[PDB]
Write an enzyme that holds these catalytic residues in place. Structure first.
Site, PDB file in Angstrom:
ATOM      1  N   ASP A  64       0.765  -1.210   0.203  1.00 30.34           N
ATOM      2  CA  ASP A  64      -0.071  -0.071  -0.024  1.00 30.34           C
ATOM      3  C   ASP A  64       0.867   1.159  -0.130  1.00 30.34           C
ATOM      4  N   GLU A 133       7.223  -0.392 -10.005  1.00 37.41           N
ATOM      5  CA  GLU A 133       8.175   0.087  -9.209  1.00 37.41           C
ATOM      6  C   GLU A 133       9.254   1.040  -9.711  1.00 37.41           C
ATOM      7  OE1 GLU A 133       7.095  -3.199  -8.960  1.00 37.41           O
ATOM      8  OE2 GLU A 133       5.339  -2.330  -7.851  1.00 37.41           O
TER       9      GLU A 133
END
Length: 250
Positions: A64, A133
């Protein structure tokens, strides 16, 4: 009774369903504990199969973000360990039972850990997988060893560098998922049908043998964890993560 998952046993099978709808199947720290707790029950009980699911449109995205930030806007000074999460994924590969991922929808780094770690991963036409990412200077350090064990170094590398989600077809061709179908329920049942026929003892001894043959996952643990701390304690990555949870990307 659990805050993040719905457990349901059926004969020799255990269904763990992630019930975390307001943070899009995101991973907290309670979820990890509840799972380890459910797996311990499956450790000695009569169960031989553990199924993971609950993703009408998202098995799990990953770490998260508003949480990684909200913690920053509370008092966060240095990142939190992912050892529990890593060991959980390791348990899935090592426990005395066949673990299975049942995927539907978008899956990002995080749900990717889960799917990669399970002994068997099945999906439907809807499943897509992605690692974004690197757009924020990060990288799925905890996920990578499990992913790599499934698809190889080059495929995991191209995926991480390219950032674009891959189709359920490529996942299949690459080995990310074993079998997939529009009717992934029927497909699951055909697997459970064959899996019963095996006994806990043979499964446990068989998995222990595969584990001793390959230490790839465990051997990389400290490096992954060391990398996780580091990329998260690095200023710049931080402001990048921050400047985005409000505005642009770069």
């Amino acid at each position: 009774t659990y805050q993040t998952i719905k457990v349901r046993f059926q004969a020799s099978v255990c269904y763990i369903t992630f019930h975390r709808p307001e943070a899009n199947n995101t991973i907290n720290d309670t979820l990890i504990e509840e799972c380890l707790q459910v797996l311990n029950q499956c450790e000695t009980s009569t169960v031989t199969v553990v199924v993971l699911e609950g993703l009408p449109e998202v098995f799990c995205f990953g770490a998260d973000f508003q949480e990684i930030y909200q913690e920053m806007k509370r008092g966060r000074k240095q990142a939190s360990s992912q050892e529990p999460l890593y060991d959980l994924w390791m348990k899935l590969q090592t426990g005395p039972y066949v673990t299975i991922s049942h995927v539907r929808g978008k899956v990002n780094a995080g749900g990717l850990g889960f799917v990669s770690a399970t002994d068997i991963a099945i999906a439907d036409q809807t499943a897509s997988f992605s690692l974004s990412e690197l757009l924020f200077g990060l990288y799925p350090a905890c996920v990578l060893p499990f992913l790599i064990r499934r698809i190889g170094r080059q495929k995991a590398h191209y995926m991480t560098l390219m950032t674009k989600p891959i189709s359920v077809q490529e996942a299949s061709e690459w080995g990310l998922i074993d079998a997939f179908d529009a009717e992934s329920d029927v497909l699951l049942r055909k697997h459970l049908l064959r899996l019963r026929r095996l006994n806990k003892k043979g499964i446990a001894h068989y998995k222990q043998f595969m584990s001793s043959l390959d230490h790839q996952v465990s051997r990389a643990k400290a490096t992954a964890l060391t990398a996780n701390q580091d990329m998260f304690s690095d200023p710049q990555n931080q402001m990048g993560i921050i400047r985005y949870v409000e505005t642009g990307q770069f």
